[PDB]
Structure 1
Amino acid sequence: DRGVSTFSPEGRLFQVEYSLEAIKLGSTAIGIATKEGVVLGVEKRATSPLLESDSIEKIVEIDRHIGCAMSGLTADARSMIEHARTAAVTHNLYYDEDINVESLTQSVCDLALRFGELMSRPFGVALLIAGHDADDGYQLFHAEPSGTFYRYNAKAIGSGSEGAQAELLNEWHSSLTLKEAELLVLKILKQVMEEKLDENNAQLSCITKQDGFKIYDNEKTAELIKELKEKEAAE
């Protein structure tokens, strides 16, 4: 057939480019970074009403100061999360401190290109890694299967990514509050989601310096959705 680690005539790795197509088919995940915290939100996208939606875990804790949202072939993310958690805990063991969000992201991205004929293919999943450290403050990273990671003020990945990113382009400014960011994720998720947004088919989370990483309750998220509807109907 053809090599797994083959370059195309344009100078790109076929398998990496194809894994990016798989991520486009994945459910939408949005991250917004502010000076009061970083917010992570996801579309759950249950394939049937009999599927208990609370068992859909697309937002995940890496450490107390680092959270993670995923999009694409979510089964592939489990080993990436395991590595990340191990890296975060191992660094704390060696250095008696929290690990930098960038260093954690770099550790995850080192796995990405370890494929050939090591694992048999790249990961089919993109990660939004959000966190906080004392050196660089609140940070949001986008970790791809290419091994590249970009820092973002705000970022959307998944099926409604290009539409959501254009919306994040206009809406984001440097003086956003945490509450403003929460509603903004819910607003953009509702726009790109096929089904109607509610507390059962969408999930919110955040990371603050004081309280650390927290996944939001369905009751808490429900109030933010109700607050969103009223403020949109307000004008």
Structure 2
Amino acid sequence: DRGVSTFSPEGRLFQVEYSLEAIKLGSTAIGIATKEGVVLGVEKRATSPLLESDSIEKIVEIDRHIGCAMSGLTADARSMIEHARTAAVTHNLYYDEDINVESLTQSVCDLALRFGELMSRPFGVALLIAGHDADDGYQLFHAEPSGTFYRYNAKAIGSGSEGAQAELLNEWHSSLTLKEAELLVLKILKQVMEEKLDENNAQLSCITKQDGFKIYDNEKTAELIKELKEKEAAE
């Protein structure tokens, strides 16, 4: 065989590149950042109809001001979320304040390359980290198993990412309202999803300065889905 921390001739780490292929097989997750808030949405993708879809937890709270969506080997994300929550709470204990979204993301990304012959392999999951702080306002970050993170105005990850990202390139502008962003996530999810989008197989969430991180009810999302279908038929 070969070392886990081996470089390829092109100057990339084999294991990190292979984990990126696992993330492409994962379910779609989309995030959009506005001046009124950040929206996070995911495809649940139940493997069977007997599976109770509400138990599928792919959007997750880290703190009141920070939320998180995932895509890939979702089991790998548990210890990442655990670390993120501890980092957020620990900082509040040491400094009597909220921790910056960027500093949280950096803390999570420090775990990424702690593998070799430390854990035995990289994480096989990508994260979208969305939050708010007083200094830099509403933010969205894409955290990869390479240990790298980019800030985004909008970002899609998962199986339908490259098609959804191209759609986000055209639709995003710096004056989007929160409601406009909500509909946009639903619209783009419906386009890349295999099965027909409804309140049971898709989930929305947002983070605002005022109310913090909230996962939407199935009743609330259902009305936004109905509002979306009516607006597309109206021209």
TM-score of the superposed pair, with normalisation by structure 2: 1.00
Residues 79-101 of structure 1 show CA distances to partners (whole Å, capped at 9, x for unaligned) of 00000000000000000000000
Partner of 1:10: 10
What is the CA-CA distance between 1:106 and the residue it aligns to? 0.1
Query: Offset at 1:167?
Result: 0.1
For residues 158 and 220 of structure 1, what CA distance do their matches in structure 2 show?
25
What's the offset of the Cα at 1:230?
Answer: 0.2
**Alignment deviations for residues 145-164 of structure 1 (CA, whole Å, 9 cap, x no partner):** 00000000000000000000
> What is the deviation of 1:122?
0.2
Give the secondary-structure state (helix, strand or coil) at the position aligned to 1:155: strand
Distance in structure 2 (CA, Å) of the matches to 1:104 and 1:113: 16
- Post-superposition Cα deviations, 1:181-233, rounded to whole Å, max 9, x if no partner, equal 00000000000000000000000000000000000000000000000000001
Deviation at 1:63, TM superposition (A): 0.1
Q: Which runs of 4+ in 1 moved over 4 A?
A: none
CA distance in 1, matches of 2:37, 2:147: 26
CA distance in 1, matches of 2:133, 2:170: 28
For residues 10-65 of structure 1, the C-alpha deviation after alignment (integer angstroms, 9 at most, x for no partner) is 00000000000000000000000000000000000000000000000000000000
- What's the C-alpha RMSD, in Å, of the aligned pairs? 0.2
Unaligned runs of 5+ in 2: none
Deviation at 1:138, TM superposition (A): 0.1
Query: 1:139 offset after TM fit, Å?
Result: 0.1
Q: Deviations over 1:87-143 (max 9, x none)?
A: 000000000000000000000000000000000000000000000000000000000
Counterpart residue number, 2:197 = 197
- In 1, Cα distance between equivalents of 2:74 and 2:212: 24
Q: Distance in 1 between matches of 2:28 and 2:234?
A: 27
Q: What secondary structure does 1:164 align onto?
A: helix
Return the alpha-carbon distance in structure 1 between the equivalents of residues 142 and 169 of structure 2: 16
Q: For the residues of structure 2 that align with 1:232 and 1:50, how far apart are their CA atoms?
A: 32
Q: How does 1:56-75 map to 2 (within 5 A)?
A: 56-75=56-75
Report how far residue 171 of structure 1 moved: 0.1
User: How far does residue 76 in structure 1 lie from its aligned partner after superposition?
Assistant: 0.1
Q: Partners in 2 of 1:184 and 1:51 — Cα distance?
A: 28
Q: Which residue of 2 aligns with 1:55?
A: 55
Q: Secondary structure at the match of 2:81?
A: helix
TM-score (norm 1): 1.00
Provide the rounded CA distance (Å) in 1 between the counterparts of 2:164 and 2:148: 21
Q: Does 1:33 align with 2:27?
A: no
Contiguous gaps of at least 5 residues in structure 1: none
Aligned length: 235
CA distance in structure 2 between the partners assigned to 1:35 and 1:13 by the alignment: 37
Distance in 1, matches of 2:231 and 2:121, equals: 46
